[PDB]
Amino acid sequence: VNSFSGYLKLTDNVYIKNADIVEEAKKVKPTVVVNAANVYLKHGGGVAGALNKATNNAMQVESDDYIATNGPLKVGGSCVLSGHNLAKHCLHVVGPNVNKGEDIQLLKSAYENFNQHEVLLAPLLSAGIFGADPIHSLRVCVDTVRTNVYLAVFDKNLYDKLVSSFL
């Protein structure tokens, strides 16, 4: 028994809610919150810019040191950094950017990173400003992640659409 509240159960291991991931994180303080990162860990908008603002820019400061030491992530890759005031850890995961010509099959690789963590609070990936279809994306999540994932969907019309169209 964990502390997530109000989620709809989609499968044995996937749960969903119409919620802002930042508000969910502040309330639950989960072991792992997933960020929808880019390869440079430049947190400008969407999930990344909202989480980072909620950390008072501490996430960006930590991220810039990570990049200076290690170089960029791979599309489909991830790194574990601090969760600051939002979670114990933040798993920064890079989904493909279809508006950069990046292969959408890399979305499955991106979700595979979630399997290294028993429980996660996460958004939908190479959703929002990353330009992917949020049906196909939910489907890849369900068919790839085997650990327990709590999805926070910010847009109400996407959520109602995702739930009503979920096979």
Ligand SMILES: c1csc(C[C@H]2CCN(c3ncnc4[nH]ccc34)C2)n1
């Ligand atoms: C509607 C318009 S763009 C879009 C797709 C993604 C971009 C923003 N995303 C979030 N997901 C969960 N919590 C969040 N909090 C802030 C942003 C956000 C999903 N949904």
